[PDB]
Amino acid sequence: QKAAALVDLAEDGIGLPVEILDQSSESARYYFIFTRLDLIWSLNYFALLFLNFFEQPLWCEKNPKPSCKDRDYYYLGELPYLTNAESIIYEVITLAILLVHTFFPISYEGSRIFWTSRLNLVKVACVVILFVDVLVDFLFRIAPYVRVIIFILSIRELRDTLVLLSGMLGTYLNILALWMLFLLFASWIAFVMFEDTQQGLTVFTSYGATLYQMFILFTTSNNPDVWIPAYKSSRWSSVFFVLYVLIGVYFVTNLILAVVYDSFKEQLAKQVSGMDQMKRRMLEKAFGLIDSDKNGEIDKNQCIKLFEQLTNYRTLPKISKEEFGLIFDNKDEFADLCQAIALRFQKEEVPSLQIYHSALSQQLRAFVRSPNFGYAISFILIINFIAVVVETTLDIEESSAQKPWQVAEFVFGWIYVLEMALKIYTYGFENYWREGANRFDFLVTWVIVIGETATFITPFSNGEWIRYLLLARMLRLIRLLMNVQRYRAFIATFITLIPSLMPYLGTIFCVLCIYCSIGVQVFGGLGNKKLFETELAEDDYLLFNFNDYPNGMVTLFNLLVMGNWQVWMESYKDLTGTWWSITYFVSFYVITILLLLNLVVAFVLEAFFTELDLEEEEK
Template identity: 25%
Template sequence: MTDKDLPNKQTSEDHDSAGVNSSFQKGADRHEKLTIISQNSVEDDEVRRESQLKKNDKSVLSLRSNDSPPIAKHEIVTPSWGPVSVERDGEVFKAVLFLMDAKKKKQPNFLDNYKSMRWYHARTKFMWKMGLFVACVIYLLVSATDTVSFNSSEDPMHWFWYQVSMQLLCDCVFIGDICAQIQAKGYRTTLNNRWTQFFCLTLVFHSVGIFWPGLQALKVTGIVRAYPIIYYNQHARNAMISYMKTLPSVTLWIGLEFFVIIIYACFCVVLYAHLDRYGESGQKAFENFAAAFVSLYSLSLTVNNPDVYLPYYKRGFLHIIVFASFLVITYFLIHNIILVRIYQIYCVKLKNNAVQRRQNRRRALCLAFEALDETKDGRLPRALVIHVLRRLWPRYDRAKIEAIMRHTHQYAPREYTFDQFEMLMTALNDRVSKHRSVRCYSPCAKRLMAFAVSAHLLVVVVSIIEFWRFFYSVRFWVLISIFRAIFTADVIYRIKRMGGIKYFIKDRFNVLNIVAILLSLVAIVAWCVGLYQDGGVSRLYPTSHMKKLAQLSVLFASCCDIARIFETIPEYNALLVVFGNLLPAFLGQAAVILTLMHVFCYIGMNIYGGKVEPTNPLWTEEPFPGNLYYTLNFNSYVEGMCT
């Protein structure tokens, strides 16, 4: 298969799976014409490009090394391919959406009309995603006011309007997003998705609890409030699917563990039941089969190790053989086999996901190339490619894109085949997502800055050691202000050196530096307010919450400044980069864990709510007196989540 034929080999099934039909709606509301820069001479064009590179982005100049071959005259001239019609602009916009999906390595899924593409593009905007995130958080935080009674008798109007207004607002946001998906993907594609089907059912199910008299049904319907977090988080959905796939294999080994516990429980009842019943062991761990099963299960998790078997060990050292063999079989053997099996399943899942993502990227690139190839000859004009890339990355000017294109290919071609187009998109994704770092300081200057950070941290630690006595002195704030002025000047210099704040914040360490400055400003304002509340007297101990806020802000700012030290140590830097890359996957796992905690919290509130109180006679018996175990309860949603 040649490069010319590759994009045209897409079958109708590929187009149907991507949600793309054959024709576009000709009533597009707006379009933009391509601006093709005409050149009078090769020399003038080269001078103009070099000047724009130096003015707009100095980092791109490094892409053109001294060893790269010169560019021929016929390769610099940009051919004109005419004005853009409304239909052609729709094809270009479709190609831009395909390229956006290719960058994210996901399968394109939108209808082949201009309106659907606009809705599809709107759902990728940051503000749209932020609105959904806020709605999910509010939807879940409503549960923080739930108690065991689920009743609005104490303050009916306040409770009712709080519950109804917040939850109806979130429901409207979710329904609006589902309608946007229908506009973008189509009615059938959207509602045939099982995740969407279950989401619609949860919205209806929870609405019943909102309008039920006295809100009594919320004790059941509130259990689904955590589902939007799973629905709008692709990593969480993948983690949930992985959990479901590991259940069959893991269940077999868990069943084997329970079988071993049952066998050992029978042996322990025979060996130690008489000792527990007559009080010779001082405990009742193996008084009967049920107690023996619970005790051994706790021992398999090392919860009661070694307290459960020490009373029997002191009667003879041979008794340790029973418990040692049990721990070897369950804790060291079966548990490790379960972990190995889960690891194997996840490895296969990750490999399949990697293959699928590569296929999705290549398919999206093929569809984008086909949409741009108006003449169907398997080649794209260079000017058209530049125009599409500028629409894909608006902050990149023409000169910068051309410089990267010249760096990708030794001789910038006038027309791009599919292989060249794919190579260019790969290089652009790497260059755009990983901006070249600019050297702002020499190694010696970096070490001096790390020394200043260490000195600043030492001042804060000394103030804590002195129980914040130094914190309320003028000397402390003078030192903090001097250090913060140095760090602020450093941030301003690096922002200017790197060409603007949008390039500065691409580095996670730089974001922490900005956060540290903001926290220091909060600390200064909070300390001034706290000093005013104390009547202008610096007291030894904080008498207001504002001074406590100032202390915490200074401490958090110092922790953020430690990132400057990590920048100078390659091992720490690499470790933080790895954690930063794994953070989305960690958040997906955390969303699943939060959902499971939410579900079991509501189950616990319905079963154990109101039964664990300090006045309960149970807490007057051993081993609970003097302890605070009664604080672990399900009397409210907050207490249940903490438990």
């Protein structure tokens, strides 16, 4: 419908999808049908992108290919790894399925328009660097790097997040320079102080070592341990370090975050503003198609229809009458009107789903929308909680009475696949997928049903571990505490934080994956027998990894939490012998600790502060 090309586009303004094709000459118009089918394609790609990115943890390492002992607990590792005969198939498969997706934009874009767009040219550019590796691998250095790189821009949420980092990255280098001058100047005054004293052994390499130590003391990871010989020479030596750590942590390290916070708050206001201009680009598009006379304004009889399919197709406002004209007695105004319909009149109605009779289903559908059903599943999870605490508490007692209660938990898992099956049937798959909590339950109910088929066709620890975890589907009981006025902002922020922090937690995560590809290449060994035991002992327990990519992934996490992080840096230094290997650890800290982790803090607070002004606005 000529009028429906705009109502559907008005709900696209409220729902906020993003596409940039101006002309186009549900059902709208031609360019839309070129892109419309991408949705199933996008859903199937979703699995491909995940597996493409994971082809690097499951990848076979590069240092085992030469000498010496092949696939041993020596130079430790723990995953399935890979055989290239079984590797290239996935390279070929993931690549081929990928290439269909990267050139699919030309369907809805122009031929030259696709090639000239900076997004699609780099997309195909990393698409051409992964094909050459595959051909050469068939008959390996920067091959995993394009996996994560083609992954970070394969998703828009990670892409706009990386762009947000760019605008604030410039001011971040200038404060790092001042941070460097502080470390530089503080290292100087510290070294001269302790050249004619006993701590000349810690300042033996002098400024080169004393800057390295004042740098880790800036992280306080070695606070009582780095200046303990000086504190043994004179008690008044501590006066310097409490002075330094004070300024270093409470003055320096604090206002560093205050920079990111403001720079992040600025760039986020830049992103949502351009998001508004983009959203209005569809709203002005919809209006521009119903204003045929180009005068800039629409008539009554020309807008009574636009409301008429807005009240029917999308949301529930009112009913049209002959009193329509009784209530009666521009381009930029229509956008505000639908945005006002978007907050009050808007409650996205059910899409279809049938060639079927409502009769037999009509019973179940009304009794399931009743609030008493919401209380029923609630009490079912309460009686499930007191049930789970008994099965688990009978494992610790080791009494064999853990068995009868643990099979009753399986019947609880059947209550929820019933609940999943009856609720998706009584609301529609799209309405059931609209709310965030129901998407979760669906995929966690489906991790139970694949467990049931597996656990019972396969044949305790085969069933206890795989099922007792999914009591996490009883975690929406925490929404109860939002009724308490105190904890409302806390839980409501946290709940709204879990998804909103995920694009930022996936970005910092991809950094480790680039970093782990580097650590694998540069640190393949570990002189494995005399340098391993001399370097670390209590920390050799810690440095039992980073010879494997998952081992490297968990140890970058240990460096990401910064818990005894310097024991990896100081060791891999003397495992390589040169001071230039600690740069990998200095570059890590600067890029993720002083930057990415400082960023996610400002996001949480700003998200919490936005939750405050929101609950303040309702009253």
